[PDB]
């Protein structure tokens, strides 16, 4: 898999972080780290993924 992953981080800008503050249901400050090799977002229904 990593043989193809060399494209990421080398050629193009990759989203590696999102930070929220009192956005939607996220009170206070929050932050999610995005792995440069691809990230999944999981959680039960109605948990704030969207």
């Amino acid at each position: 898999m990593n043989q193809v992953s060399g494209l990421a981080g080398k050629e193009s800008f990759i989203l590696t972080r999102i930070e929220l503050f009192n956005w939607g249901g996220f009170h206070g400050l929050h932050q999610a780290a995005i792995h440069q090799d691809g990230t999944a977002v999981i959680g039960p229904t109605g948990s704030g993924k969207t």
Binding site: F21, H27, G28, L29, H30, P44
Partner: protein, 50 residues
């Protein structure tokens, strides 16, 4: 000198049509305190249903 003369109506301006949408309500300001809290929210440790 407050009689009303029979001069015509010319330059009759039509303005201020009372559309109900045009109303906006009072913006009472709040100045009691500030919401400085931006703690890391370390309570996010994983504890999810089976």
């Amino acid at each position: 000198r407050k009689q009303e003369v029979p001069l015509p109506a010319v330059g009759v301006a039509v303005t201020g049509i009372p559309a109900i949408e045009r109303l906006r309500f009072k913006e009472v300001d709040d100045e009691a305190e500030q919401t400085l809290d931006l703690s890391n929210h370390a309570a996010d440790l994983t504890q999810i249903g089976d």
